[PDB]
Amino acid sequence: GIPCGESCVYIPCTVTALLGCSCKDKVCYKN
Numbered sequence: 001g002i003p004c005g006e007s008c009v010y011i012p013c014t015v016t017a018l019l020g021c022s023c024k025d026k027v028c029y030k031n
Contacts, residue, residue, distance in 0.1 A: 001029055001030070001031045002021075002029055002030045002031060003027060003028075003029055004016035004019055004021035004027075004028045004029060004030050005028075006021070006027075006028050007026055007028060008023035008026050008027070008028055009026060013028040016028040016030070
């Protein structure tokens with residue numbers, strides 16, 4: 001639910017992927 005900022009527009013999130021953020025609504029959120 002926490003917006004990690006980085007979004008998955010064209011490619012998957014890479015920096016927030018390290019934070020444990022998931023691609024949801026094309027934005028990466030962590031819970």
